Design a protein around this ligand. Structure first.
Ligand SMILES: *C(=O)[C@]1([C@@H](O)[C@@H]2C=CCCC2)NC(=O)[C@H](CCO)[C@]1(C)O
Lengths: 233, 250, 212, 198, 244, 204, 242, 241
């Protein structure tokens, strides 16, 4: 079975499945956990940075795409770089040509389409990375979840990566609560850190291990790493 | 999209055979028989019009085609392949010769062109060889009359007389008995008709048989007068009636 | 513009004026006409400021890449030909440059190559480029000796630019001096022509025609 | 233009080329060697457009040296000149043609005879006893038409050229700063370092 | 995708051999035998016509001997059509050389170029090689008479006497047995016919099954002449050499 | 300026009884400066002759091109090219450069090897064929040649007679042209043999 | 067959993983980063005594402030080094400054996944991944001394110390216990020299091993044999001292 | 259009097409190079699968890339031609732009690059060739000897051999070549070279060619006799014991 239909993305299995895409999705699950949640004034990204050795650094998982948009990655870092770079250009184009900040919803659509082209043609490969996009645009705070399959969804919060299911159930429970944390970033962030720790097991979030990013009403998308996240550990 | 088949589909096997050429030749073997006979003053090529249905109009399908006013061709094997080979042949006769020297190419050279087209379908990426063998008859000032066979590999050889397709083995044998270097065109036509009769199962007449010759110039088939040096085509397809008249003297 | 470069016992002297003009307008009296390709190579600029500045800086980048690749100092012959060949690719497009590529390698010794936007590449001992060249050549030709001392050579160059700055409306401002040795070039100051003129006049007795 | 002269005597070809390089108002150099050795027994002199001149010469030189290595053989002077003519004949119909005129002097070791080829920038090639490019022919051809002999010695050829150069130095408006002379014979190419007063 | 159907005509075997080349050579080994013998005063090219009929027109035929230049010719062993493709490009290269240098192309230069083309189909492009082997007989004023050979691999070598096609082993042994450096064109012509005669897979060796050519420097002239023998000419020499 | 008036030169061909003649001057100059007195403008491929006037570099290039093409022709056709066919090859080769033509005035002369019929033809720089039965002129003195030919010429002249005529036509036309002269060569052509004669004329 | 950019059922790219296997077979390379500079050392590993060891160049200069060591199919690293030198020089031409070590590294890693037979994303013309990993070390004003490990996967990690090549699992374990935030350049040197000696099949000497470093003051320098030999001696002595 | 990845990684981390390329080199005739104190000598063996060749015209095993550098090889002959041509072209280009001929290491690094490139480009197989490149850098008298292989890897050797039975001859060289005292003579160097080949050529006066390269473009090939003479003097060294 599978073996005869998973040689490339241009092949459907007898049940209508695209294995190469599914295998790509697997690279995400093997990725370090990351969380995203928003209120009506802010959107927060909390990501667990993973390190190789105790002599290595904890690889960055948050990329800023514009002053009002950014994302967290889980899976192949190079693929996140490619996709985020495409997003940086799209945001940039919107500004230069229409003097308009790109709508988070529009960014989601563009990412979906870019990923889709790599699932219907021979020679290429699906992207092997998941992305959580947050941003504050003309319709408020936003959070998006991007899957290599090309499926992008808007949520109040979510998580991807290894053991992400913990944080996700926590948020699905804490919903009514954090969704109202308007005007108070530190509270939204703490809520995010509380959701992410729901997926810990190995260790505990340390200073050079925790990575946070926020964007909102009067807050340009900014990243906090190390000492700057201490007040949340 | 984009033809991504840039590699050969015909390659050498351990034994040294070129599979696809072989298979193409096999397709030719199953084809209806066709033959050609060279006389001292002309050449005749003929084949059977194997009408695939009585509702079909066998005249709307010519197995014998004019390539130039002094060269004609017939085949055995895959009809559609032949049809496009003829379009390409007629065109190459112009682009690679008439538009350069202001005259139609000599038989061997046009044959050489066709052969090249076929050889390429034996080595170019993404294609299969042509499933046909052609018999090309023509005349040119410095070579007189000639008859050539072109196979799927692109190889070609001159003949005094030969046959290809279904009953080629038997037909070639019968031709070896009747051929001599003093045959007149009518004699060749007669021999051609006899040879073709052994290969035809059903009806054998001017409506089931297709035959053409390369002979004298037909000024009546030129279409205009005024140029002394333009005397008309040497190629001429016989009419159903012309064939039957000769069948009575069979 | 007046730029010059000459070969002698102590290496190479490179002297240039520092005036920039667009028509009769003196755009600047403090322009750099010498490009420090790298610690061992100097380039002079005459004609189009942008063309020279741009391609001579680029030249440095190419020289550096060479040394990383060949783990060995680039030759003046090779550095000059890189610029020469680049410029030749653009022949007819309108580049405008009169240049001197100067260096002192172990293999070649003191070397100067004149390179212009016409694609011309000439090795030589003495070169002057610019609207003031003829003035500098007069001074240079009659006082040049291969056995000049570094001190005297530096002065000859400075004096020659002075001659040109005085007579050429398009030359002046100040004089920038350089000495090129196998171990690299040594900058030898910026000399305002205003002051330099009176000084030289008094100490030398020349420019008798000017009232001071 | 610069002075480009060539003469084919009994057993050698002699090329004389002006040493000046003038750019605008000034003579930038007076020791310029307007020549490139294409092979041990073939020399080419040239005159024309500022940058094209050397770029073409060196380009041809590169090609001949490459051929020599590939074949471990030295192309005949005639072969080299045809290659050069073709290069110029292509150039004349290109975007920006090489405005270069050349004289190719070579000693054919197989025929054991010197040969002189004149080719202008259009790819116009002709073989001659003596030739020139530009205005040079205007002042010197009457002298060469007079004193030339197929059996001249190299020494006689040098004396005839000296005469030509003197006529050029008398009637020509420009100071070309003398000429560099080179001999091409069965033994190769050598330069007459003493013509400043021969 | 397409990858599925790619034969990969240009890869090495675990032993470091080129599959397609080896198979093409295997193909060549069943082709009519062609022989080349170089003498002090000329060169001989002889070839056996594979497959023949009473009706085959031999006067208008040529399947093994082709003129490339006025001083160079080749004998073909393998796919005729593939040969013609190469022959034509060879004829063009000769002319390009002539136009460029105004001198006929040296024999080796033309042979190397053709072999280089063959070598290409061996390292890139994903196409089958040409199932052809050539014996080159030519003359130039640097090496005089020369005899070369090139096969599917794109490799070429020089010879005094050589053969390509079927039964080369047997043919080579016979040639290596009777060849002598001081041979003469007429001696060579006879050696060639004798060799083919003993290696033929056919009953007898008749004229209708042969193609013959010689490149001599006709004493009464001073130039090089190529003679592609005519049917009657072969028939003649066949009797004289005592094979009737 | 005018590519056809830089190097100078002329060519003329005539038909006679079972023969044809093609002649040309030997000059090659650079405007007023004479450069070569040995620049022949007649070439031949097999038994077909071609004279070319005009820009020297193109004359040389065209000859090399036709040598190249007639060689491949012989190799494939297995016979030498004929006058009529070559004329067509010249025409199509010139037209191929319709918008960047060779600045030449070609002239074809020869006898058909199979019909024995004499043949001459001229072309303009873009291939237009002129197939005259009498004579064809080309070059910087073509007006003068037309004058000479139209008067001196008469049909069916024998080889020895045609020689005198073609020569007088060439010689006197060249002497009224600043860019022609400095030597001349005439080709008398017959089915079997071809004789080439150099003429004696002024050298100014 | 199977595409060169196919995912395994585990979510890994076969070619990239198989690439890592080739790297394991390569000679050892170690890098140690200290506040006094970064040391880079490698195992020459000549294949025959007739091979002139000094012609083995597994440590190359990218720019005055960046050097790098390789391990694996070293021939595959030439175009990477070339791209690196060009990126650094180009950056300087465009900005009149030094390219940050991290930036230089990211540029090299951008080539990494540019392989395939027609991957829909741009024009990645390269038939396979690189079969060599690199240790990029350097210094810059914003982040001081740095050591990076660039893999054919395209990802790069910053390390305080790192070993790649045949003896990496072992050497890395060693580095884990030997590295501390206050190592001096000399301690690092001896340390690299020691670990190389432990994992090298051959007895480490100044001919089958080579050291180098990069310091803000003098930039990237490759230690000539004489200099290293002494450091070898100094190591033997400190070890025999207990 | 053809761009199939022919050279790819296998699970164990190998690139079989490059690996098999080496196998083609093992099958090639042996080649050896040894550097003296003031020269470098290149020796090659001559196959004998067929003998009746015309030695004058048959392509030789040592090729001049420029007047001061030569290249020999083991492997596919047709493949070596491609590398040689590119090397010769690159040699002239270098002289044209840098106004100085290539150093031996530069020329080597170039050939190796071409080889490496053919191991990771689509639609092409690696070169089934290994080379020995020797000569003297312009204005330098220190001998140079380098070796390249299909992978694109290269390095310099005091002496080295490639091709069939190179294993054998390398051993000979490893216990017959002292870096302390390299063949201080053109003669004793050529001898050591012939000796190493005799370990595998099995009596082949006409099966052994040698080329001597000295400083300043001084390159010359020995004749059968000159070599045959070395062989003779060598067989005696043995019998005289
Ligand atoms: C001298 O060549 C020039 C200078 O303005 C530039 C300035 C900076 C570097 C290159 C030299 N160039 C000109 O075009 C000026 C004259 C315009 O008539 C001037 C001052 O001679």
């Amino acid at each position: 079975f599978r073996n005869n239909y998973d040689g490339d993305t241009v092949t459907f299995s007898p049940t209508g499945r695209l294995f190469q895409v599914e295998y790509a999705l697997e690279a995400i699950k093997q990725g370090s956990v990351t969380v995203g949640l928003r209120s009506n004034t802010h959107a927060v990204l909390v990501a667990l940075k993973r390190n190789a050795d105790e002599l290595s650094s904890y690889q960055k998982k948050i990329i800023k795409c514009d002053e009002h948009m950014g994302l967290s990655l889980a899976g192949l870092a190079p693929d996140a770089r490619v996709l985020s770079n495409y997003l940086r250009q799209q945001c940039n184009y919107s500004s230069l040509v229409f003097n308009r900040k790109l709508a988070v919803e529009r960014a989601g659509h563009l990412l979906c389409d870019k990923a889709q082209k790599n699932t219907q043609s021979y020679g290429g490969r699906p992207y092997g990375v998941g992305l959580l996009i947050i941003g504050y645009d003309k319709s408020g705070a936003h959070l998006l979840e991007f899957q290599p399959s090309g499926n992008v969804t808007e949520l109040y919060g979510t998580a991807i990566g290894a053991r992400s299911q913990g944080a996700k159930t926590y948020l699905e429970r804490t919903l009514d609560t954090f969704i109202k944390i308007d005007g108070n970033p530190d509270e939204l962030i703490k809520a995010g850190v509380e959701a992410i720790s729901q997926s810990l097991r190995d260790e505990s979030l340390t200073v050079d291990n925790l990575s946070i990013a926020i964007v909102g009403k009067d807050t340009p998308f900014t990243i906090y790493d190390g000492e700057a996240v201490a007040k949340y550990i | 999209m984009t033809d991504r088949y840039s590699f050969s589909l015909t390659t050498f096997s351990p034994s040294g055979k070129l599979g696809q050429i072989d298979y193409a030749l096999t397709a030719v073997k199953q084809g209806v028989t066709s033959l050609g006979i060279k006389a001292t003053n002309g050449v005749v090529i003929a084949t059977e019009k194997k009408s695939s249905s009585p509702l079909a109009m066998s005249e709307t399908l010519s197995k014998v085609s004019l390539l130039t006013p002094d060269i004609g061709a017939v085949y055995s094997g895959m009809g559609p392949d032949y049809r496009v080979l003829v379009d390409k042949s007629r065109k190459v006769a112009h682009t690679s010769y008439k538009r350069i020297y202001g005259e139609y190419p000599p038989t061997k050279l046009l044959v050489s062109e066709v052969a090249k087209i076929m050889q390429e379908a034996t080595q170019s990426g993404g294609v299969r060889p042509f499933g046909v063998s052609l018999l090309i008859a023509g005349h040119d000032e410095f070579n007189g009359f000639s008859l050539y066979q072109v196979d799927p590999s692109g190889s070609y050889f001159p003949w005094k007389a030969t046959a290809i397709g279904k009953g080629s083995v038997a037909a070639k044998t019968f031709l070896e008995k009747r051929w001599n270097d003093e045959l007149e065109l009518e004699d060749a036509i007669h021999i051609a008709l006899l040879t073709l009769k052994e290969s035809v199962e059903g009806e054998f007449n001017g409506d089931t048989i297709e035959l053409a010759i390369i002979g004298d110039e037909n000024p009546d088939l030129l279409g205009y007068t005024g140029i002394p040096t333009d005397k008309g085509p040497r190629f001429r397809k016989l009419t159903s009636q012309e064939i039957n008249d000769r069948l009575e003297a069979l | 513009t007046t730029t010059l470069a000459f070969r002698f016992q102590g290496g190479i002297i490179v002297a240039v004026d520092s005036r920039a003009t667009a028509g009769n307008w003196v755009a600047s009296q403090t322009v750099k006409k010498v490009i420090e390709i790298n610690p061992f190579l100097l380039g002079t600029m005459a004609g189009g400021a942008a063309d020279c500045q741009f391609w001579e800086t680029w030249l440095g980048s190419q020289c550096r890449l060479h040394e990383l690749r060949e783990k060995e100092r680039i030759s003046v012959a090779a550095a000059s030909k890189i610029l020469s060949n680049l410029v030749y690719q653009y022949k007819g497009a309108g580049l405008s440059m009169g240049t001197m590529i100067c260096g002192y390698t172990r293999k070649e010794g003191p070397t100067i190559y004149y390179v212009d936007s016409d694609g011309t590449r000439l090795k030589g001992d003495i070169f002057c480029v610019g609207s003031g060249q003829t003035f500098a050549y007069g001074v240079l030709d009659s006082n040049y000796k291969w056995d000049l001392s570094v001190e005297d050579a530096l002065y000859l160059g400075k004096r020659s630019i002075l001659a040109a700055a005085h007579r050429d409306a398009y030359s002046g401002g100040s004089v920038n001096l350089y000495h090129v040795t196998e171990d690299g070039w040594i900058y030898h100051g910026n000399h305002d022509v205003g002051e330099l003129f009176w000084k030289v006049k008094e100490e030398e007795g020349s420019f008798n025609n000017v009232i001071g | 233009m610069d002075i480009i002269l060539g003469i084919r005597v009994q057993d050698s070809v002699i090329l004389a080329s002006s040493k000046a390089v003038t750019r605008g108002i000034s003579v930038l150099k007076d020791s310029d060697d307007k020549t490139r050795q294409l092979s041990p027994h073939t020399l080419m002199s040239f005159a024309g457009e500022a940058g094209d001149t050397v770029q073409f010469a060196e380009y041809i030189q590169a090609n001949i040296q490459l051929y020599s290595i590939r074949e471990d053989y030295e192309l005949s002077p005639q072969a080299v000149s045809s290659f050069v003519r073709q290069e110029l004949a292509k150039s004349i119909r290109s975007r920006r043609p090489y405005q270069v005129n050349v004289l190719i002097g070579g000693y054919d070791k197989k025929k054991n005879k010197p040969e002189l080829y004149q080719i202008d920038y259009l790819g116009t090639k002709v073989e001659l006893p003596y030739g020139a490019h530009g205005y040079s022919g205007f002042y010197t051809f009457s002298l060469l038409d007079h004193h030339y002999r197929p059996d001249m010695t190299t020494e006689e050829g040098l004396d005839l050229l000296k005469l030509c150069v003197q006529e050029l130095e008398k009637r020509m408006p420009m100071d070309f700063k003398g000429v560099i002379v080179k001999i091409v014979d069965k033994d190769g190419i050598r330069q007459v370092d003493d013509f400043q007063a021969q | 995708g397409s990858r599925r159907y790619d034969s990969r005509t240009t890869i090495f075997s675990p032993e470091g051999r080129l599959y397609q080349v080896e198979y093409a050579l295997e193909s060549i080994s069943h082709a009519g035998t062609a022989i080349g013998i170089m003498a002090s005063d000329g060169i001989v090219l002889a070839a056996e016509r594979k497959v023949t009929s009473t009706l085959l027109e031999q006067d208008t035929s040529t399947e093994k001997l082709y003129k490339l230049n006025d001083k160079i010719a080749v004998a073909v062993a393998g796919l005729t059509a593939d040969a013609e493709i190469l022959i034509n490009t060879a004829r063009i290269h000769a002319q390009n050389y002539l136009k460029t240098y105004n001198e006929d192309i040296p024999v080796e230069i033309l042979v190397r170029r053709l072999s280089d083309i063959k070598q290409g189909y061996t390292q890139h492009g994903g196409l089958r090689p040409f199932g052809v082997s050539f014996i080159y007989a030519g003359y130039d004023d640097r090496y005089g008479y020369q005899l070369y050979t090139s096969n599917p691999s794109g490799n070429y070598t020089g010879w005094k006497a050589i053969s390509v096609g079927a039964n080369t082993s047997a043919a080579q042994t016979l040639l290596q047995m009777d060849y002598k450096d001081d041979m003469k064109v007429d001696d060579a012509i006879e050696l060639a016919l004798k060799t083919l005669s003993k290696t033929t897979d056919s009953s007898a060796l008749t004229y209708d099954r042969l193609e013959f050519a010689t490149i001599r420097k006709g004493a009464n002239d001073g130039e090089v002449y190529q003679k592609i023998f005519k049917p009657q000419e072969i028939k003649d020499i066949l009797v004289k050499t005592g094979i009737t | 300026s005018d590519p056809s008036s830089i190097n100078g030169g002329i060519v003329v061909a005539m038909t006679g009884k079972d023969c044809v003649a093609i002649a040309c001057d030997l000059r090659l100059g650079s405007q007023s400066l004479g450069v070569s007195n040995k620049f022949e403008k007649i070439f031949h491929y097999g038994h077909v002759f071609l004279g070319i006037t005009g820009l020297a570099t193109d004359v040389t290039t065209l000859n090399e091109m036709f040598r190249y093409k007639t060689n491949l022709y012989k190799l494939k056709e297995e016979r030498a090219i004929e006058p009529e066919t070559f004329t067509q090859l010249v025409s199509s080769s010139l037209y191929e450069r319709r918008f960047g033509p060779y600045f030449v005035g070609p002239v074809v002369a020869g006898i058909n090897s199979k019909s024995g019929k004499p043949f001459i033809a001229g072309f303009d720089l873009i291939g237009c064929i002129d197939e005259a039965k009498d004579f064809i002129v080309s070059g910087t003195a073509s007006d003068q040649l037309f004058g000479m030919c139209e008067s001196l010429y008469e049909p069916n002249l024998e080889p020895e007679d045609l020689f005198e005529t073609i020569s007088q036509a060439l010689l006197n036309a060249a002497d009224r042209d600043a860019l022609s002269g400095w030597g001349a060569v005439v080709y008398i052509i017959k089915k079997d043999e071809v004789v080439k004669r150099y003429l004696k004329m002024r050298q100014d | 067959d199977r595409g060169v950019s196919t995912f395994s059922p585990e979510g890994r790219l076969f070619q990239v993983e198989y690439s890592l296997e080739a790297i394991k077979l390569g000679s050892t390379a170690i890098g140690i980063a200290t506040k006094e500079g970064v040391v880079l050392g490698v195992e020459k590993r000549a294949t025959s005594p007739l091979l002139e060891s000094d012609s083995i160049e597994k440590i190359v200069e990218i720019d005055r402030h960046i050097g790098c060591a390789m391990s694996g199919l070293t021939a595959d690293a030439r175009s990477m080094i070339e791209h690196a030198r060009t990126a650094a020089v180009t950056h300087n031409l465009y900005y009149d400054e030094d390219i940050n070590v991290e930036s230089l590294t990211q540029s090299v890693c951008d080539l990494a996944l540019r392989f395939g037979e027609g991957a829909s994303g741009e024009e990645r013309l390269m038939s396979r991944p690189f079969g060599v990993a690199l240790l990029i070390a350097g210094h810059d004003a914003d982040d001081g001394y740095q050591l990076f490990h660039a893999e054919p996967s395209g990802t790069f990690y910053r390390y305080n110390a790192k070993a790649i090549g045949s003896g990496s699992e072992g050497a890395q374990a060693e580095l884990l216990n030997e590295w501390h935030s206050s190592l001096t350049l000399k301690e690092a040197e001896l340390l690299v020299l020691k670990i190389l000696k432990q994992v090298m099949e051959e007895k480490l000497d100044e001919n089958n091993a080579q050291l180098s470093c990069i310091t803000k003051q003098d930039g990237f320098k490759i230690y000539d044999n004489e200099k290293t030999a002494e450091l070898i001696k100094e190591l033997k002595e400190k070890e025999a001292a207990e | 259009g053809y761009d199939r990845a022919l050279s790819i990684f296998s699970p164990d981390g190998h690139i079989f097409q490059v690996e098999y390329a080496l196998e083609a080199v093992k099958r090639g005739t042996c080649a050896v190079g040894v550097k003296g104190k003031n020269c470098v000598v290149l020796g090659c063996e001559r196959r004998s699968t067929l003998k009746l060749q015309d030695t004058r015209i048959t392509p030789s095993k040592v090729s001049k890339i420029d007047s001061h550098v030569v290249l020999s090889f083991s492997g596919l002959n047709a493949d070596s031609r491609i590398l040689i041509e590119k090397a010769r072209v690159e040699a002239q280009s270098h002289r044209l732009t840098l106004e100085d001929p290539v150093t031996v290491e530069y020329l080597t690094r170039y050939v190796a690059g071409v080889q490496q490139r053919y191991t990771q480009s689509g639609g092409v197989r690696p070169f089934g060739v290994s080379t020995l490149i020797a000569g003297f850098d312009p204005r330098d008298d220190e001998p140079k000897l380098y070796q390249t292989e299909p992978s694109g890897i290269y390095s310099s050797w005091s002496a080295q051999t490639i091709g069939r039975n190179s294993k054998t001859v390398r051993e000979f060289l490893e216990k017959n070549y002292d870096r302390k005292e390299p063949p201080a003579t053109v003669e004793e160097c050529v001898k050591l070279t012939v000796r190493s080949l005799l370990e595998v050529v099995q009596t082949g006066a006409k099966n052994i060619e040698i080329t001597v390269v000295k400083p300043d473009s001084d390159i010359v090939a020995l004749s059968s006799e000159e070599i045959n003479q070395y062989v003779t003097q060598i067989e005696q060294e043995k019998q005289e014991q």
